[PDB]
């Protein structure tokens, strides 16, 4: 991911789409892509807040991730055009918004991150 | 000291990390998973479905692989990956600092 959420004047909806799924236009994605990307984003946020956090509780982390995994298994089982699946997507997008952290840790291996371009590499030319 | 003569970039081998070590660590991480049954059957040419990794278990395994290898993998690259061979190739050729 380019990790450019806070740059290029993204609106809140666009930033939420980028966080939940790798793309800014989730409609292009199919059912499996949507479900897998949302599950990955939810797991990443839960790991950030309940493993690499302030006095994190690993037992609570395990319970939360297990519940999330069960819910996402049910979501994947559900059909794309289902109000229950829509409710699950809304629930987990709301969870992502709730856990959204300004100045959240951005790995140095991603573009647009701090220290991303500190050095200019000279070409063979 | 660098010689006064012109020296060009030396791309020794596309891998920035020992590919064998990367593959072995990734295979160990995959075997750690509950769904995976037979570690022996896992090979670089073995697909995720045949080794037993479900689409949902794949994202968990990839997140833990990111944690283990100290890198972040884009969803596009993770979806493009089709075999352990491709996964290990991408991880080994990846520059850990981008």
């Amino acid at each position: 991911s380019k990790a450019y959420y806070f740059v290029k004047n993204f609106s809140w909806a666009e930033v939420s789409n980028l966080l939940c799924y790798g793309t800014k236009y989730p409609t292009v994605l199919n059912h499996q892509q949507k479900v897998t990307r949302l599950y990955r984003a939810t797991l990443r946020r839960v790991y950030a807040h309940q493993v690499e956090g302030y006095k994190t509780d690993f037992k609570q982390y395990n319970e939360n991730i297990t519940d999330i995994g069960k819910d996402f298994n049910k979501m994947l089982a559900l059909k794309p055009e289902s109000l229950e699946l829509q409710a699950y997507f809304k629930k987990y997008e709301d969870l992502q918004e709730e856990l959204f952290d300004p100045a959240m840790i951005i790995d140095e291996s991603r573009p647009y991150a701090a220290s991303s371009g500190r050095y200019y590499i000279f070409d063979d030319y | 000291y660098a010689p006064q003569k012109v020296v060009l970039r030396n791309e020794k081998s596309g891998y920035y990390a020992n590919p064998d070590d990367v593959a072995r660590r990734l295979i160990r991480l995959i075997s750690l998973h509950d769904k995976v049954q037979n570690p022996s059957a896992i090979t670089l040419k073995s697909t995720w479905s045949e080794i037993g990794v479900d689409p949902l278990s794949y994202v968990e395994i990839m997140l833990e692989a990111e944690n283990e290898f100290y890198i972040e993998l884009a969803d596009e690259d993770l979806e493009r990956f089709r075999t352990v061979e491709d996964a290990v190739e991408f991880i080994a050729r990846n520059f850990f600092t981008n």
């Binding site: 590499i121 | 970039r9 791309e11 920035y16 020992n18 520059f95 981008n98």
Partner: peptide, 26 residues
């Protein structure tokens, strides 16, 4: 241990313009 190759040129990925640079955003 491993003999790493030289720093990749992908460290600075060239940016290709895909949208018009509106004069109103000068």
């Amino acid at each position: 241990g491993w003999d790493r190759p030289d720093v990749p040129l992908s460290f600075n990925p060239l940016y290709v313009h895909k949208r018009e640079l509106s004069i109103f955003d000068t």
